[PDB]
From a paper:
A single ER‐localised Fic protein, FICD (HYPE), catalyses both AMPylation and deAMPylation of BiP. FICD is a class II Fic protein (with its αinh N‐terminal to its Fic domain) and an ER‐localised type II, single‐pass transmembrane protein, with a short cytoplasmic portion and a large luminal‐facing catalytic domain (Worby et al, 2009; Bunney et al, 2014).
These techniques also reaffirmed the strong disrupting effect of the Leu258Asp mutation (in the principal dimer surface) and revealed a weaker disrupting effect of a Gly299Ser mutation (in the secondary dimer surface; Fig EV1D–G). Complete monomerisation resulted in a 19‐fold increase in AMPylation activity and a 2‐fold decrease in deAMPylation activity. Accordingly, the greatest root‐mean‐squared deviation (RMSD) between the Fic domain of the FICD:ATP structure and any other monomeric or dimer relay FICD structure is 0.53 Å (observed between FICD:ATP and FICDL258D:Apo; residues 213–407). Notably, in all FICD structures the αinh remains firmly juxtaposed to the core Fic domain.
Numbering used by the authors: 103 to 439
């Protein structure tokens, strides 16, 4: 018996008086105490909706309904929100497409563009290893790759992760981006071969034959991995996927590979590279999930496990905008002497 009903009732009482800042803390607290508490989700939805935060209200109702599909108070409200959410999400994909288009208006040989592209190349390597706890600094990663000399006082393992990423990004940018044709299984194993080849050569480029623990999660049985990965690459080359928005498609491709967890190590890194391969193949620039976005990343992945991928997609879309804003942050300004 969760003792959050107390918290929910006070929240409703505060809301009645109009102490809304005290209400949402009691709402948040009620779902801290019981995250699967239908009345608190539903009531906190209505709350959010009164403040015109439609996406949150809709998330909350959608959570309530994944737990209790027949909860009539939620069913009625999510009918009203779902269409307005589709609208809001669609307008954000338009602003991103705006910035992509402006970025792809820059002549290919532009120097400023050349320099920020290679600056952000080291940024993407730094963030994709640092988000997992790799203690190497940006300047250390540039040092390792520009020269070929190991950084003093940093483990071999950390530095091989960096070289490994570099080896993988070469292979994608050289081979797979330009290449007309299907994204085969062999492509995904080849990325993983390079990602992990310097740290764990034995496992580098082959699927796990064992069960794994990923925190409190247990991904699919190793005998389902082969089946589910063949459904994945079939979906990657399918007509439905090309029917999706490319950012939407890239986000789903990423989440699916994370969920399947087909390798022992380097699923995260291997699926952040696949995401970028998908975006680039569609004419979109590759993107970075910054180190400091670790919590947001975990939480949106967790929301995707609890039956709602939309927050994850929105997350990837915001990361896409933040990349474009950076590329655009190198554009011409009037000046004379």
């Amino acid at each position: 018996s969760l003792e959050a009903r107390a918290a929910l009732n006070q929240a409703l009482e505060m809301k009645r008086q109009g102490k809304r800042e005290k209400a949402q803390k009691l709402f948040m607290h009620a779902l801290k105490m019981d995250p699967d508490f239908v009345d608190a989700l539903t009531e906190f939805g209505i709350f959010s909706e009164e403040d015109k935060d439609i996406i949150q209200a809709d998330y909350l109702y959608t959570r309530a309904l994944t737990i209790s599909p027949y909860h009539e108070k939620a069913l009625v409200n999510r009918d009203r929100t779902l269409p307005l959410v589709e609208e809001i999400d669609q307008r954000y994909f338009s602003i991103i497409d705006s910035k992509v288009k402006k970025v792809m208006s820059i002549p290919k040989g532009n120097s400023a563009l050349r320099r920020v592209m290679e600056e952000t190349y080291y940024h993407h390597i730094y963030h994709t290893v640092a988000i997992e706890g790799n203690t190497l600094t940006l300047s250390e990663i540039r040092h390792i790759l520009e020269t070929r000399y190991a950084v003093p006082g940093k483990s071999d393992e950390e530095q091989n992760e960096v070289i490994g990423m570099h080896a993988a990004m070469k292979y994608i940018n050289t081979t797979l981006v330009s290449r007309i044709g299907s994204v085969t299984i062999s492509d995904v194993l080849e990325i993983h071969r390079r990602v992990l080849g310097y740290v764990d050569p034995v496992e580098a480029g082959r699927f796990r034959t064992t069960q794994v623990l990923v925190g409190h999660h247990i991904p699919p049985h190793p005998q389902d991995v082969e089946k589910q990965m063949q459904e994945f690459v079939q979906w990657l080359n399918s007509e439905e996927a090309m029917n999706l928005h490319p950012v939407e498609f890239a986000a789903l491709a990423h989440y699916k590979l994370v969920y399947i967890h087909p390798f022992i190590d380097g699923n995260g890194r291997t699926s952040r590279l696949l995401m970028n391969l998908i975006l680039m193949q569609a004419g979109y620039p590759p993107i970075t999930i910054r180190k400091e976005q670790r919590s947001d990343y975990y939480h949106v992945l967790e929301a995707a496990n609890e039956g709602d991928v939309r927050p994850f997609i929105r997350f990837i879309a915001k990361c896409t905008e933040t990349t474009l804003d950076t590329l655009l942050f190198a554009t011409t300004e009037y000046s004379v002497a």
